[PDB]
């Protein structure tokens, strides 16, 4: 048999942190835990007890001029991106810049060659799911007013048809819950719909 096998840096790291070198390397986003906040750096801890630090250039955005302590405090965990890993010393440096924490989405290295990958199908499914995300729900509006009636434009005109000239009805507007359509009889078989824009609304159903 071969002599006793001595663990190396990668094997020791995997044994201690129970995290593989592949799953913990450059270009990965992990929810680290803030442990100490300082003006020039922030000391954070990962899930696997790996102590990390970030130099002041990356805790806050380059455009912002605030203080690290005001924005982030102890116990406020944030997402971070791995920049460097000291496997021997179990030390890592992180970045809070959104160019890493947000843009890194397709982190897999799957070969997307059109000859062997159906890019068109994945794209089509992508707009399908994005349109599904765009899909929402809407409901009717209820208003309490003596001259308010939940009628269509033609319905309001027909309701005012049986009434003499000058009678007024109020119905929801098609421009949104912040708009109100008022229909009044200008003349026999002649009606005017006037849109009213609402400001400082307390509620969608409120006036």
């Amino acid at each position: 048999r071969r002599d006793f096998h001595i663990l190396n840096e990668a094997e020791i790291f995997q044994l201690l942190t129970r995290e593989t070198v592949d799953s913990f390397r450059k270009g990965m986003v992990i929810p680290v835990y803030v442990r100490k906040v300082e003006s020039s750096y922030m000391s954070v801890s990962t899930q696997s007890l790996i102590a990390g630090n970030i130099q002041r250039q990356d805790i806050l955005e380059p455009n912002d001029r605030r203080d690290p302590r005001e924005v982030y405090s102890v116990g406020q965990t944030v997402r971070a991106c791995i920049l460097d890993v000291d496997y021997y010393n179990f030390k890592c440096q992180l970045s809070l810049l959104r160019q890493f924490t947000e843009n890194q989405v397709a982190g897999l290295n799957v070969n997307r060659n059109p000859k062997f990958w159906d890019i068109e199908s994945e794209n089509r499914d992508r707009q399908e799911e994005i349109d599904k995300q765009r899909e929402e729900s809407r409901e009717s509006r209820v208003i309490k007013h003596p001259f308010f009636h939940n009628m269509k434009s033609k319905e309001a005109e027909d309701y005012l048809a049986a009434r003499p000239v000058g009678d007024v009805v109020i119905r929801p507007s098609s421009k949104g819950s912040n708009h109100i359509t008022i229909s009044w009889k200008v003349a026999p078989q002649l009606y005017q719909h006037i849109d009213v824009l609402e400001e400082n609304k307390d509620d969608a159903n409120a006036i």
């Binding site: 929810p31 835990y33 801890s45 899930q47 007890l49 406020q76 965990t77 944030v78 997402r79 799911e129 599904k132 995300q133």
Partner: protein
């Protein structure tokens, strides 16, 4: 974590993964911290919802 089911004797299992709240931390898509027992809803897919039982990676 993969989504499969296994059957093993109690001896074969390594040990329970005792994790403190300083270790069992979850962050949602928007970046807001979510703790144990909170209710979240899947952003896409089946869009299901439920209470968090355990957080790992």
């Amino acid at each position: 974590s993969d989504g499969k089911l296994l059957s093993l004797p109690p001896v074969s299992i390594y040990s329970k993964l005792n994790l403190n709240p300083n270790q069992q931390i979850a962050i949602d898509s928007n970046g807001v911290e979510v703790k144990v027992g909170d209710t979240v809803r899947e952003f896409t897919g089946e869009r299901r919802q439920g209470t968090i039982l355990h957080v790992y990676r």
